[PDB]
Amino acid sequence: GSNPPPPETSNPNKPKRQTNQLQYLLRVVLKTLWKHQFAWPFQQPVDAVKLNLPDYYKIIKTPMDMGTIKKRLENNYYWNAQECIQDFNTMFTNCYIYNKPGDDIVLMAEALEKLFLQKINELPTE
Numbered sequence: 001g002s003n004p005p006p007p008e009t010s011n012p013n014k015p016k017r018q019t020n021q022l023q024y025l026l027r028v029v030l031k032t033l034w035k036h037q038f039a040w041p042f043q044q045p046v047d048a049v050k051l052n053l054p055d056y057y058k059i060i061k062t063p064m065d066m067g068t069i070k071k072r073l074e075n076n077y078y079w080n081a082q083e084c085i086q087d088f089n090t091m092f093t094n095c096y097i098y099n100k101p102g103d104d105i106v107l108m109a110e111a112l113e114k115l116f117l118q119k120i121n122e123l124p125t126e
């Protein structure tokens, strides 16, 4: 069972820009989540080979991770903050779809999602 190619972190013809909200998302929101104790399983694409998860990409068809999100923010992949947030929401949702209520990884994702939502409320006005 091979790995799919990871999600793109740059695209010539996908519209993109910088906003102060996207700056906040990188320097504050992503940074704090990256540093959290529970971040590590979310810091790179699911390696279905070496983690022995042969069914992962059978269930999950739109994978996302914080490694991808960080690269995207650094490269200014996004048009707005809402597109980035959708990538975080995809990451969390994948975890909840693939796993079961109360699983270790699900409990970690909920803790990260709680901190994310808190950080998201203090997002600059423009």
Ligand SMILES: CCN1C(=O)c2cccc3c(NS(=O)(=O)c4cc(Br)ccc4OC)ccc1c23
Residues within 6 Å of the ligand: 041, 042, 046, 051, 053, 094, 095, 098, 099, 104, 105, 108
């Ligand atoms: C967050 C992405 N992700 C999973 O949804 C998932 C499910 C099961 C194992 C692993 C996984 N393998 S692991 O060795 O880091 C792992 C972490 C935790 Br927390 C609990 C169990 C486990 O492997 C069995 C890495 C990333 C993910 C998963």
